[PDB]
Amino acid sequence: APLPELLSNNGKHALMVDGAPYIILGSQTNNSSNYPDALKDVWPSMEKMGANTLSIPVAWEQIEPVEGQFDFSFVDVLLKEARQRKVRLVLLWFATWKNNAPHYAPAWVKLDNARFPRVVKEDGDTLNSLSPLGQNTLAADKKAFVELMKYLAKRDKDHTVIMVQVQNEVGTYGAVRDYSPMAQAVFNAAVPDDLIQKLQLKPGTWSQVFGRDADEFFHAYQIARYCDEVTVAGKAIKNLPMYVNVALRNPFNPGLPGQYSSGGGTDNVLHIWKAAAPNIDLIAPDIYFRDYKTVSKVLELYTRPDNALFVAEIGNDQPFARYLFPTLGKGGIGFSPFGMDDTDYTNYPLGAKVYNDETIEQFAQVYRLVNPMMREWARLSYQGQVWGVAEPLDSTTETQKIWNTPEEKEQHKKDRASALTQQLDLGLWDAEVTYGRPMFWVTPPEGNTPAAGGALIAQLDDNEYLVTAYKARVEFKPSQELAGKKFMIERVEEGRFEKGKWVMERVWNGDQTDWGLNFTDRPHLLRVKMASYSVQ
Amino acid sequence: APLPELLSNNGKHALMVDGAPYIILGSQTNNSSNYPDALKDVWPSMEKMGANTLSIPVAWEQIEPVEGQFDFSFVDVLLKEARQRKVRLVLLWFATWKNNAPHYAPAWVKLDNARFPRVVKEDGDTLNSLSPLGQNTLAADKKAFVELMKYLAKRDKDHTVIMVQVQNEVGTYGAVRDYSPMAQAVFNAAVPDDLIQKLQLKPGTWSQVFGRDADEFFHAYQIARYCDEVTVAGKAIKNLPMYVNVALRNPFNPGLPGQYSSGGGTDNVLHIWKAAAPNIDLIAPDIYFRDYKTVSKVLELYTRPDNALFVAEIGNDQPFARYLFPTLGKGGIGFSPFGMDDTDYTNYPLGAKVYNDETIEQFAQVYRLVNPMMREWARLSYQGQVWGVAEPLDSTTETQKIWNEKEQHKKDRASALTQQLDLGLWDAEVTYGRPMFWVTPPEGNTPAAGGALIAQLDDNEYLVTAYKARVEFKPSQELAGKKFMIERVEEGRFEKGKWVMERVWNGDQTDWGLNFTDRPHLLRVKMASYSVQ
Numbered sequence A: 001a002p003l004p005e006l007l008s009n010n011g012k013h014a015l016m017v018d019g020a021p022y023i024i025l026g027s028q029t030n031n032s033s034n035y036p037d038a039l040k041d042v043w044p045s046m047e048k049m050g051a052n053t054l055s056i057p058v059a060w061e062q063i064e065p066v067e068g069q070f071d072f073s074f075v076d077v078l079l080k081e082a083r084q085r086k087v088r089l090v091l092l093w094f095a096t097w098k099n100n101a102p103h104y105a106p107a108w109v110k111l112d113n114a115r116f117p118r119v120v121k122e123d124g125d126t127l128n129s130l131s132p133l134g135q136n137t138l139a140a141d142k143k144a145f146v147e148l149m150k151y152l153a154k155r156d157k158d159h160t161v162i163m164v165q166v167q168n169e170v171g172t173y174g175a176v177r178d179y180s181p182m183a184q185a186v187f188n189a190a191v192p193d194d195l196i197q198k199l200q201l202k203p204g205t206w207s208q209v210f211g212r213d214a215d216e217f218f219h220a221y222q223i224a225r226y227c228d229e230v231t232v233a234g235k236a237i238k239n240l241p242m243y244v245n246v247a248l249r250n251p252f253n254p255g256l257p258g259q260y261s262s263g264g265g266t267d268n269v270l271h272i273w274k275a276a277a278p279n280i281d282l283i284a285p286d287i288y289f290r291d292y293k294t295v296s297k298v299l300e301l302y303t304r305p306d307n308a309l310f311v312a313e314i315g316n317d318q319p320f321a322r323y324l325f326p327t328l329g330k331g332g333i334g335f336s337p338f339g340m341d342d343t344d345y346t347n348y349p350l351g352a353k354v355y356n357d358e359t360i361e362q363f364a365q366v367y368r369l370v371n372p373m374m375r376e377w378a379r380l381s382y383q384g385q386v387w388g389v390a391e392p393l394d395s396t397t398e399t400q401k402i403w404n405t406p407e408e409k410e411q412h413k414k415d416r417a418s419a420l421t422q423q424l425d426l427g428l429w430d431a432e433v434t435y436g437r438p439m440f441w442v443t444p445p446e447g448n449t450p451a452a453g454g455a456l457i458a459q460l461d462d463n464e465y466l467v468t469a470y471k472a473r474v475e476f477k478p479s480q481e482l483a484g485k486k487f488m489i490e491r492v493e494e495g496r497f498e499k500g501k502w503v504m505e506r507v508w509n510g511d512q513t514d515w516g517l518n519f520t521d522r523p524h525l526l527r528v529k530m531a532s533y534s535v536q
Numbered sequence B: 001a002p003l004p005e006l007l008s009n010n011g012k013h014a015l016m017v018d019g020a021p022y023i024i025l026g027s028q029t030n031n032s033s034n035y036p037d038a039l040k041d042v043w044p045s046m047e048k049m050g051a052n053t054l055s056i057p058v059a060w061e062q063i064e065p066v067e068g069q070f071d072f073s074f075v076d077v078l079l080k081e082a083r084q085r086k087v088r089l090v091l092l093w094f095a096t097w098k099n100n101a102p103h104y105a106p107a108w109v110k111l112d113n114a115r116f117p118r119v120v121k122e123d124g125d126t127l128n129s130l131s132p133l134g135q136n137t138l139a140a141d142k143k144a145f146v147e148l149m150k151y152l153a154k155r156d157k158d159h160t161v162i163m164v165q166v167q168n169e170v171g172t173y174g175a176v177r178d179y180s181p182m183a184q185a186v187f188n189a190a191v192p193d194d195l196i197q198k199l200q201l202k203p204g205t206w207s208q209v210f211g212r213d214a215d216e217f218f219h220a221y222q223i224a225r226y227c228d229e230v231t232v233a234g235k236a237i238k239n240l241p242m243y244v245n246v247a248l249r250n251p252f253n254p255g256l257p258g259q260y261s262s263g264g265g266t267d268n269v270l271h272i273w274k275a276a277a278p279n280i281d282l283i284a285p286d287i288y289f290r291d292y293k294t295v296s297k298v299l300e301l302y303t304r305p306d307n308a309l310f311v312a313e314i315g316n317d318q319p320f321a322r323y324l325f326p327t328l329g330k331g332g333i334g335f336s337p338f339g340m341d342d343t344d345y346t347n348y349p350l351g352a353k354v355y356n357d358e359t360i361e362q363f364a365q366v367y368r369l370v371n372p373m374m375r376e377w378a379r380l381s382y383q384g385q386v387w388g389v390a391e392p393l394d395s396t397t398e399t400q401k402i403w404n405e406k407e408q409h410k411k412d413r414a415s416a417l418t419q420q421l422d423l424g425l426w427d428a429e430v431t432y433g434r435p436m437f438w439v440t441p442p443e444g445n446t447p448a449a450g451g452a453l454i455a456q457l458d459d460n461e462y463l464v465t466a467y468k469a470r471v472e473f474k475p476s477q478e479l480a481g482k483k484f485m486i487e488r489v490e491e492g493r494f495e496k497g498k499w500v501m502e503r504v505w506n507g508d509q510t511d512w513g514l515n516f517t518d519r520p521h522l523l524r525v526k527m528a529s530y531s532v533q
């Protein structure tokens, strides 16, 4: 089997696994699940969820508890047990930074500030965040990362591990950058020529070149460099795809760096990160916003010709499940809900209040739409045209229920039906996606309670589309005036792929096609052929 | 075994299956279940329902996907699976019209308007409704139908398939008829003498003869002839019973043709359909009206000396189940609730919001009354006297609920929930929603659900079975000094056509009428007048 690789071409992207595009329909563990004993509490969720890929930490403290004394006993067991369950892995390298901090570095690292120095604030106080300009730190992290990758080269010939995250949520809370004498010496010095030439700027010192942004861009540049060097070193051993995951700032109202995690790949510093760390394959958003407007904005910012979309973290509460659809519609390579294990921890108010089969089942339901076509979908998304949408109104609040005049009620229902109707330009044909209405007749949509639906569409040919959707109606129509022809559905087939060949189960027709294509919680994969026809 | 056939004599009808009267206690699939892979989501509901007959589509598009290249692979599987389950079939031929439209016709038909022309409106816009004046369409439909019937003649010698529906809900929405120059040439022309003579009318052109009804009567005639032609051709091959099913207009407030599906067998054109299509066995209503008054009206209009009642489609929501009773009461040959499969579709608000075991059980409960006596009831319906009633108030509304003098409303609902049946020398009074003891007035079941069947066995003897109701017997006429009583009530079953007694109802079980809950009981009730001289 060939190595996994992130391919990029013509504004589009694919995670290759075993020589073809692949989608990560993932589960991520809680942060303390990276031990042999905890795996029994991980696997049952993954099976209930139907995930193909587990994201799980491998901690520097665990593999190198004493300096030079390595321990891959966790990695051994994890590999074997993944293989028994025929799932893949994304290993998360928790090392110099895990959520800005060194807690997962071995004690001989995190307790020796002299050797492995922290970020100093402008006021001279010290933050528990390791400086990207500590050369011993970089050397030490590199060396352990290399041993991990050596373990993979020796013991993972079939690439059970498909990708590695290098650090977890890098940056600094509480200051913009390192203000140490060591850091200040670099800040006062000329900006590296490499960055100047890539950005096509005038040479000068950090403050001369970037002004108001010098402190934050400096920290991003130094962090990116460090992560790049770590990545290069590991990939020299085994050239897996590697990525970084971002503690996002609010894209509409970020506040100041240091309120958010300064130096990470936030939307304002993506240009710095891409310039500085050409060996990092992509920069992944960690999504804990619940509201459709903010989530959608994040997906837009992180989907770039130079950046494959991977939702490396998202909340595991019900509202988050539907963001699978726009993720996949943007050509994303994967989606990884956080905290999908039974190790007795919930990060509520971020994720679900109660972790039970119902929590898992919200994701299982959407995953069951994609799993039966995963490779086909993956191919279409890289090489062709795909689309995807989620229900665009969040669930009605109690504040909103309380204020629910007879003419006012009517106007609001109208407003909401319009908001809950989405248009997709599919070339010669459009789709109209609507949420929360009967399977029969044309009563306006009123939304699902809770908000939950979505759809996937892939273009097979000029008049032919793959469609599957969830608690929604999909209706097709011409994209342009027909100049006197009529149109109809030629044929809608429900079916599946077997050995990459379409197998028809049944034809949808009559009531099933009179009123759009109506989907509940169950999985149906459709091929939809449209026709215009003359009546002259 | 002998061919199934519809008999009609002396104002009565029967569907003969295997040489004796038969009642269709049916189930009908949703519209996209006519494939091998879907049948696993059909059979379990049928079994939970206790249905004896499955109505399922056979689509023109599936049997002739490319012109002249026939494919009966579905019919094959369907026949074998039905026989394994020991049930019968009604095939629904979805061809030139399914609900006005050609969607089930093959691509080479529905995408070729030059060859197979659509209805043209008065303003020259075109509707997706195939014109009955399209002679290429009629020939093509006929040829494929003939091929289906050929398949049955060769491959169904035991008549698993007992009846065939020709098209599904014919007619046109959006226009009264085709106004294409081709159609206009016929409309301007003489009305066919055969129709003139059957209707005892003066000869003349369509507008001359029918005036304000010309447009609709023209479309009704032209669709009737088309359908009769397909029927005749298929019966030449194998003479099964064949019928058409009607997208009803509201009998009390129809609106205009084209608002409703113009040219179907609606109650105002039954006379045209009967004169134009003498080879179609019956015209069957499709019933989605929920309300007792309207359903009752529909049942009244479609049960005629020339028309056997078959409720070819009805909704599967709970209020519909009790309409089995008046359907059978009227001499109905069957009843076919729509949407009885697990293929993840509901037509709510027409049928049930949620399709589950509870949905099915509402029908299974009423079918359980009739299955144990199906052949005996079928016989008594054709060759004798039967009656059937449903609870005649619909479930109280939320705003009648938040309405509510109270003693007067209760007195009115009581009178309303009391039905009289004239059984010759004896009458029956059927009441709904009261205890099994004493005489407190009826208050209705919640939701509305009761009914009753009765068949006369001799002057003084009746077969009775009912559901969430009380049945009381009394003399029909004054007894001129005699008293009366129940002589004997026997609960039992038929075994090999013989009545087998289980027990005698008496004492409490007969002091207060004959009280039925949700469980099945079949009673033989013998009444007597007696002298006290």
Ligand SMILES: *[C@H]1[C@H](N)[C@H](CO)[C@H](O)[C@H](O)[C@H]1O
Binding pocket: A031, A099, A168, A169, A245, A286, A313, A338, A347, A350
């Ligand atoms: C993403 C996120 N902050 C969760 C919070 O529960 C967790 O800390 C993950 O490790 C982060 O990467």
Ligand SMILES: *[C@H]1[C@H](N)[C@H](CO)[C@H](O)[C@H](O)[C@H]1O
Binding pocket: A510, A511, B031, B099, B168, B169, B245, B286, B313, B338, B347, B350
């Ligand atoms: C009767 C009715 N219109 C239902 C609606 O779900 C369905 O279209 C059947 O095919 C019709 O015959």
Ligand code: NA
Binding pocket: A425, A426, A427, A428, A429, A479, A480
């Ligand atoms: Na277009």
Ligand code: NA
Binding pocket: A425, A479, A480
């Ligand atoms: Na367009």
Ligand code: NA
Binding pocket: A494, A495, A505, A523, A524, A525
């Ligand atoms: Na399927």
Ligand code: NA
Binding pocket: A531, A532, A533
């Ligand atoms: Na065309």
Ligand code: NA
Binding pocket: B012, B013, B014, B331, B332, B333, B381, B382
């Ligand atoms: Na009869």
Ligand code: NA
Binding pocket: B422, B423, B424, B425, B426, B476, B477
């Ligand atoms: Na009488």
Ligand code: NA
Binding pocket: B422, B476, B477
């Ligand atoms: Na009388």
Ligand code: NA
Binding pocket: B491, B492, B502, B520, B521, B522
């Ligand atoms: Na009994």
Ligand code: NA
Binding pocket: B528, B529, B530
């Ligand atoms: Na007597």
